[PDB]
Protein backbone atom coordinates (compact mmCIF):
# COMPACT_ATOMS: atom_id res chain seq x y z
CA UNK A 1 0.00 0.00 0.00
CA UNK A 2 3.00 2.27 0.65
CA UNK A 3 4.53 1.39 -2.75
CA UNK A 4 1.17 1.63 -4.59
CA UNK A 5 0.54 5.09 -3.08
CA UNK A 6 3.92 6.35 -4.36
CA UNK A 7 3.72 5.61 -8.12
CA UNK A 8 0.10 6.84 -8.07
CA UNK A 9 0.90 10.24 -6.50
CA UNK A 10 4.61 10.72 -7.29
CA UNK A 11 4.61 10.53 -11.11
CA UNK A 12 4.75 12.71 -14.23
CA UNK A 13 1.84 12.02 -16.59
CA UNK A 14 1.79 13.11 -20.24
CA UNK A 15 -1.43 15.04 -20.92
CA UNK A 16 -2.05 16.61 -24.36
CA UNK A 17 -2.41 20.29 -25.27
CA UNK A 18 -5.00 23.01 -25.95
CA UNK A 19 -5.50 23.56 -29.70
CA UNK A 20 -3.68 20.24 -30.40
CA UNK A 21 -2.54 19.20 -33.89
CA UNK A 22 -5.66 18.53 -35.97
CA UNK A 23 -7.36 21.76 -34.84
CA UNK A 24 -10.68 23.55 -35.39
CA UNK A 25 -10.15 26.15 -38.13
CA UNK A 26 -9.79 29.53 -36.41
CA UNK A 27 -7.91 28.34 -33.31
CA UNK A 28 -5.94 31.27 -31.88
CA UNK A 29 -4.02 29.86 -28.89
CA UNK A 30 -1.90 26.70 -28.75
CA UNK A 31 -0.70 25.94 -25.21
CA UNK A 32 0.60 22.79 -23.48
CA UNK A 33 -1.28 21.12 -20.61
CA UNK A 34 0.49 20.31 -17.32
CA UNK A 35 -1.04 17.73 -14.97
CA UNK A 36 0.73 15.78 -12.20
CA UNK A 37 4.40 16.70 -11.68
CA UNK A 38 7.18 14.81 -9.86
CA UNK A 39 7.52 15.46 -6.11
CA UNK A 40 10.60 17.42 -5.02
CA UNK A 41 11.08 17.42 -1.22
CA UNK A 42 10.79 15.40 2.02
CA UNK A 43 7.64 17.35 2.97
CA UNK A 44 5.74 16.52 -0.25
CA UNK A 45 6.50 12.81 0.19
CA UNK A 46 5.28 13.05 3.79
CA UNK A 47 1.93 14.36 2.55
CA UNK A 48 1.21 11.26 0.42
CA UNK A 49 -2.29 10.00 1.29
CA UNK A 50 -2.72 6.27 1.97
Amino acid sequence: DVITAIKAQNAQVAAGQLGGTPPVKGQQLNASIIAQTRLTSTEEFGKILL
Binding site: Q12, A14, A15, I34
Partner: protein, 195 residues
Protein backbone atom coordinates in the same frame (compact mmCIF):
# COMPACT_ATOMS: atom_id res chain seq x y z
CA UNK B 1 69.03 8.72 -71.06
CA UNK B 2 66.93 7.12 -73.83
CA UNK B 3 63.53 8.43 -75.04
CA UNK B 4 61.42 5.28 -75.62
CA UNK B 5 61.69 4.15 -71.97
CA UNK B 6 60.81 7.60 -70.58
CA UNK B 7 57.89 8.06 -73.01
CA UNK B 8 56.52 4.79 -71.56
CA UNK B 9 56.91 5.95 -67.93
CA UNK B 10 54.54 8.79 -68.86
CA UNK B 11 52.11 6.18 -70.25
CA UNK B 12 52.10 4.42 -66.85
CA UNK B 13 51.54 7.79 -65.12
CA UNK B 14 48.82 8.41 -67.75
CA UNK B 15 46.99 5.13 -66.98
CA UNK B 16 47.50 5.07 -63.19
CA UNK B 17 46.20 8.65 -63.02
CA UNK B 18 43.46 7.78 -65.51
CA UNK B 19 42.23 4.85 -63.40
CA UNK B 20 42.04 7.15 -60.35
CA UNK B 21 39.51 9.36 -62.18
CA UNK B 22 37.14 6.36 -62.02
CA UNK B 23 36.37 7.41 -58.44
CA UNK B 24 33.64 9.40 -60.21
CA UNK B 25 31.17 10.45 -58.98
CA UNK B 26 33.73 12.32 -56.87
CA UNK B 27 31.95 14.42 -54.21
CA UNK B 28 32.68 18.09 -53.39
CA UNK B 29 34.09 18.19 -49.82
CA UNK B 30 36.66 16.89 -47.98
CA UNK B 31 34.93 16.23 -44.66
CA UNK B 32 35.16 18.89 -41.94
CA UNK B 33 32.54 17.81 -39.41
CA UNK B 34 33.57 16.71 -35.88
CA UNK B 35 31.50 13.46 -35.90
CA UNK B 36 27.90 13.81 -34.69
CA UNK B 37 26.01 10.91 -33.11
CA UNK B 38 22.44 11.84 -32.12
CA UNK B 39 20.00 10.06 -29.79
CA UNK B 40 16.25 10.67 -30.22
CA UNK B 41 13.22 9.78 -28.09
CA UNK B 42 9.54 10.81 -28.14
CA UNK B 43 7.00 10.86 -25.30
CA UNK B 44 3.64 11.35 -27.09
CA UNK B 45 1.50 14.23 -25.77
CA UNK B 46 3.91 15.05 -22.93
CA UNK B 47 5.12 18.53 -21.90
CA UNK B 48 8.68 19.94 -22.01
CA UNK B 49 9.31 19.81 -18.24
CA UNK B 50 8.25 16.16 -17.91
CA UNK B 51 10.21 14.82 -20.94
CA UNK B 52 13.34 16.42 -19.47
CA UNK B 53 12.92 14.77 -16.06
CA UNK B 54 11.52 11.43 -17.31
CA UNK B 55 13.59 10.81 -20.47
CA UNK B 56 16.26 13.49 -21.13
CA UNK B 57 17.90 13.31 -17.68
CA UNK B 58 17.79 9.49 -17.65
CA UNK B 59 19.69 9.33 -20.96
CA UNK B 60 22.38 11.90 -20.00
CA UNK B 61 22.91 10.30 -16.57
CA UNK B 62 23.68 7.08 -18.44
CA UNK B 63 26.31 8.54 -20.79
CA UNK B 64 29.59 7.52 -19.14
CA UNK B 65 32.64 5.75 -20.60
CA UNK B 66 32.12 6.69 -24.25
CA UNK B 67 35.51 6.51 -26.01
CA UNK B 68 36.26 10.11 -27.05
CA UNK B 69 33.79 13.03 -26.90
CA UNK B 70 33.89 16.83 -27.06
CA UNK B 71 30.54 17.64 -25.39
CA UNK B 72 26.83 16.73 -25.30
CA UNK B 73 23.92 19.05 -26.17
CA UNK B 74 20.26 18.40 -25.31
CA UNK B 75 16.86 19.84 -26.30
CA UNK B 76 13.70 18.27 -24.73
CA UNK B 77 10.87 20.04 -26.59
CA UNK B 78 7.20 20.84 -25.80
CA UNK B 79 6.07 18.33 -28.46
CA UNK B 80 7.72 15.58 -26.38
CA UNK B 81 10.82 15.21 -28.57
CA UNK B 82 14.38 15.09 -27.21
CA UNK B 83 17.71 15.03 -29.07
CA UNK B 84 21.13 14.39 -27.51
CA UNK B 85 23.97 15.09 -29.96
CA UNK B 86 27.17 13.50 -28.66
CA UNK B 87 29.87 15.25 -30.69
CA UNK B 88 33.23 13.50 -31.10
CA UNK B 89 36.80 14.45 -32.10
CA UNK B 90 37.42 15.06 -35.81
CA UNK B 91 38.65 11.70 -37.14
CA UNK B 92 37.16 9.21 -34.66
CA UNK B 93 35.56 6.07 -36.13
CA UNK B 94 31.96 7.19 -36.74
CA UNK B 95 30.96 3.51 -36.82
CA UNK B 96 32.39 2.72 -33.36
CA UNK B 97 31.24 6.08 -31.92
CA UNK B 98 27.79 4.94 -33.07
CA UNK B 99 27.56 1.61 -31.22
CA UNK B 100 29.08 2.60 -27.85
CA UNK B 101 26.60 5.50 -27.55
CA UNK B 102 23.82 3.02 -28.40
CA UNK B 103 25.07 0.56 -25.74
CA UNK B 104 25.01 3.25 -23.03
CA UNK B 105 21.38 3.81 -24.06
CA UNK B 106 20.79 0.06 -23.55
CA UNK B 107 21.33 0.67 -19.82
CA UNK B 108 18.85 3.57 -19.64
CA UNK B 109 16.26 1.93 -21.93
CA UNK B 110 14.09 0.17 -19.30
CA UNK B 111 14.07 3.25 -17.03
CA UNK B 112 12.14 5.13 -19.73
CA UNK B 113 8.30 5.02 -19.41
CA UNK B 114 6.49 2.37 -21.50
CA UNK B 115 4.89 5.21 -23.50
CA UNK B 116 8.25 6.45 -24.88
CA UNK B 117 9.76 2.95 -25.39
CA UNK B 118 7.10 1.77 -27.88
CA UNK B 119 7.45 5.18 -29.56
CA UNK B 120 10.77 4.24 -31.20
CA UNK B 121 14.05 5.56 -29.74
CA UNK B 122 16.91 5.68 -32.27
CA UNK B 123 20.64 6.41 -32.60
CA UNK B 124 22.09 7.58 -35.93
CA UNK B 125 24.90 9.60 -37.54
CA UNK B 126 24.22 13.28 -38.31
CA UNK B 127 25.08 16.16 -40.67
CA UNK B 128 22.61 18.85 -39.45
CA UNK B 129 22.04 19.81 -43.12
CA UNK B 130 20.08 18.19 -45.96
CA UNK B 131 21.82 16.70 -49.00
CA UNK B 132 18.76 16.31 -51.24
CA UNK B 133 14.99 16.87 -51.06
CA UNK B 134 12.64 15.03 -53.43
CA UNK B 135 9.06 16.35 -53.39
CA UNK B 136 6.07 14.27 -54.49
CA UNK B 137 3.13 16.25 -55.93
CA UNK B 138 -0.12 15.16 -57.63
CA UNK B 139 -1.34 16.34 -61.05
CA UNK B 140 -4.33 14.13 -62.00
CA UNK B 141 -6.78 12.53 -59.55
CA UNK B 142 -5.46 14.89 -56.87
CA UNK B 143 -4.81 13.11 -53.57
CA UNK B 144 -4.15 14.92 -50.23
CA UNK B 145 -1.40 15.84 -47.72
CA UNK B 146 -2.53 12.83 -45.67
CA UNK B 147 -2.81 10.64 -48.78
CA UNK B 148 0.54 11.51 -50.43
CA UNK B 149 2.59 11.45 -47.18
CA UNK B 150 1.32 7.93 -46.46
CA UNK B 151 2.14 6.62 -49.95
CA UNK B 152 5.56 8.34 -49.97
CA UNK B 153 6.28 6.35 -46.78
CA UNK B 154 4.58 3.01 -47.51
CA UNK B 155 6.10 2.67 -51.00
CA UNK B 156 9.37 4.65 -51.14
CA UNK B 157 10.63 5.97 -47.76
CA UNK B 158 11.48 2.48 -46.43
CA UNK B 159 13.74 1.80 -49.45
CA UNK B 160 15.74 4.94 -48.60
CA UNK B 161 17.18 5.50 -45.06
CA UNK B 162 18.54 1.98 -45.63
CA UNK B 163 20.18 2.58 -49.04
CA UNK B 164 23.54 4.26 -49.90
CA UNK B 165 24.82 5.56 -46.53
CA UNK B 166 21.84 7.61 -45.38
CA UNK B 167 22.02 9.13 -41.88
CA UNK B 168 18.29 9.71 -41.39
CA UNK B 169 15.39 10.72 -43.65
CA UNK B 170 12.90 13.36 -42.51
CA UNK B 171 9.61 12.62 -44.27
CA UNK B 172 7.49 15.73 -44.88
CA UNK B 173 4.19 14.41 -43.51
CA UNK B 174 3.13 11.12 -41.90
CA UNK B 175 2.13 7.59 -42.91
CA UNK B 176 -1.49 6.54 -42.29
CA UNK B 177 -2.76 5.37 -38.90
CA UNK B 178 -6.14 4.17 -37.66
CA UNK B 179 -7.27 7.48 -36.14
CA UNK B 180 -10.11 7.11 -33.64
CA UNK B 181 -11.69 10.46 -32.75
CA UNK B 182 -13.70 10.00 -29.53
CA UNK B 183 -16.72 12.02 -28.40
CA UNK B 184 -17.05 12.95 -24.68
CA UNK B 185 -20.85 13.30 -24.74
CA UNK B 186 -21.32 10.04 -26.65
CA UNK B 187 -18.89 8.41 -24.20
CA UNK B 188 -20.80 9.93 -21.25
CA UNK B 189 -24.09 8.78 -22.82
CA UNK B 190 -23.22 5.07 -22.60
CA UNK B 191 -21.10 5.42 -19.42
CA UNK B 192 -17.72 4.96 -21.13
CA UNK B 193 -14.24 6.37 -20.48
CA UNK B 194 -11.44 6.61 -23.12
CA UNK B 195 -9.96 3.71 -21.11
Amino acid sequence: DRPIFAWVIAIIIMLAGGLAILKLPVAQYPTIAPPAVTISASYPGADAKTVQDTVTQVIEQNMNGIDNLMYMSSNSDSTGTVQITLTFESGTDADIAQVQVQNKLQLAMPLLPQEVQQQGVSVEKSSSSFLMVVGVINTDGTMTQEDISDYVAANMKDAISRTSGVGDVQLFGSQYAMRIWMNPNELNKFQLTPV
